[PDB]
């Protein structure tokens, strides 16, 4: 089987550059074009590039000139890219696949993505507070407040887990290199204050494990 | 320029049902060959893109014929007969040739009954006051459909700086979509005003939802 098996992970400081690779097994890597599509978070796929491992030649999206620098190594069918002067924007998975033509004239083969994260911030554990009802119905909705850690991810459960439906956990939003999130949980009105709600926010990176029990605001 | 203009952006169905995404090239997309160069891809959650069809009708290795595409010039299309549970996902079409080029994307979600949003508006905790930050959070939870607009009042005046917002993916259970907003102040600025305002703007209502509190009431 054709497979492209891509650098793991990589977190950056603004301005320095990274290098990711796409090792390519199962096919004759000197006689197909090579590609590199970018996704930031949320958004849709980018064509960054492509180069042919045959003699080198390349072809860039006119938008990543000068930011994406594609080089390929014939010995060990492996291909790479190097983004300079990286910044936020940077931030972003990044695929690499073979366009094949033949039986078939397209991508039909992606790696599994190397996710590259631009950031200054410095491990941060998470501040937790308590989401609860101000003022004293039948359904009552209860949360917690994750905010200021660095970096992803934080595990969000409520009562160990055991409490599942009617829960909402939001992805978390970056302000100011830092990352905020909240979680909500809506239960029967006779369970709460009468039987216990409490969300535990773990934050591995941090080594840090944080539990709130809601409580009426009295 | 030669973009590649992929609409609709989001395209709910009831599963079984039809869904056809469309794609237009500002110019006429030339010929590589007879073969016109116009792929369409689909990207399930946390996976890396995976071709469905090339060439503009020709179904990939393993895809079913459920999926078939077509078009000429600067239109194309890809149809899906019987959407099924597992074909959701974002569709993305793609230019091969010349430019290689992206669509923006079709999310390809679940359709329901419309449902107004439950709000639930929070203030900040003693805890995050003791530290001197101030979030106010609200919630807008299982609405549909997706679209909805949050407007945050302090003393019935409009604040828009210093609020972040964060929203799920549909719910796998009631197909709903649900919303996080939290406006961010100092304990200063947030302890020099009264009322404190969260409002939802849903097409399930022609007069806005409004969740409030006002500081001093306890």
């Known amino acids: 089987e054709v497979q492209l098996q891509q650098s793991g992970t990589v977190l950056a400081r603004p301005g320095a550059s990274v290098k990711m690779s796409c090792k390519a097994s199962?096919?004759?890597?000197?006689?197909?074009?090579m590609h590199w599509i970018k996704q930031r978070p949320g958004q849709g796929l980018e064509w960054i590039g492509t180069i042919y491992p045959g003699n080198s030649d390349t072809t860039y999206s006119q938008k990543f000139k000068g930011k994406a620098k594609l080089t390929a190594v014939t010995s060990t069918s492996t291909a790479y890219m190097e983004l300079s002067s990286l910044t936020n924007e940077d931030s972003a998975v990044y695929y690499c696949?073979?366009?094949?033509?033949?039986?078939?004239?397209?991508?039909?083969?992606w790696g599994q993505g190397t996710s590259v994260t631009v950031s200054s911030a410095k491990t941060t554990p998470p501040s937790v507070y308590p989401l609860a009802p101000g003022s004293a119905n039948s359904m009552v909705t209860l949360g917690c407040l994750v905010k200021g850690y660095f970096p992803e991810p934080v595990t969000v459960t409520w009562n160990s887990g055991s409490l599942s439906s009617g829960v909402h956990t939001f992805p978390a939003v970056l302000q100011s290199d830092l990352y905020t999130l909240s979680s909500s949980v809506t239960v029967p009105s006779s369970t709460w204050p009468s039987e216990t709600v409490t969300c535990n926010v773990a934050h591995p990176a941090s080594s840090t494990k944080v539990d709130k029990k809601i409580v009426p605001r009295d | 320029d030669v973009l590649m203009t992929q609409t609709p952006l989001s395209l709910p169905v009831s599963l079984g049902d039809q869904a056809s995404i469309s794609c237009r090239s500002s110019?006429?997309?030339?010929?590589?060959?007879?073969?016109?160069?116009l792929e369409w891809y689909l990207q399930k959650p946390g996976q890396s893109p995976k071709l469905l069809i090339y060439?503009?009708?020709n179904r990939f290795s393993g895809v079913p014929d459920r999926f078939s595409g077509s078009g000429s010039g600067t239109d194309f299309t890809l149809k899906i007969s019987r959407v099924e549970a597992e074909d959701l996902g974002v569709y993305y079409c793609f230019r091969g040739s010349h430019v290689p080029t992206f669509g923006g994307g079709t999310k390809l979600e679940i359709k329901r009954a419309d449902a107004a949003p439950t709000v639930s508006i929070f203030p900040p905790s003693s805890e995050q006051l003791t530290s001197g930050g101030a979030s106010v959070v609200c919630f807008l939870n299982n609405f549909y459909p997706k679209d909805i607009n949050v407007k945050w009042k302090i003393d019935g005046s409009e604040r828009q700086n210093g609020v972040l917002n964060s929203w799920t993916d549909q719910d796998s259970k009631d197909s709903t979509y649900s919303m996080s907003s939290t406006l961010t102040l100092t304990k200063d600025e947030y302890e020099r005003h009264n009322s404190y305002t969260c409002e939802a703007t849903h097409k399930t209502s022609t007069s806005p939802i409004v969740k409030s509190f006002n500081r001093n009431e306890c």
């Open positions: 199962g096919y004759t890597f000197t006689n197909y074009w």
């Open positions: 060439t503009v009708s």
């Open positions: 110019q006429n997309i030339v010929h590589s060959x007879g073969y016109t160069y």
């Open positions: 696949s073979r366009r094949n033509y033949g039986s078939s004239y397209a991508m039909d083969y």
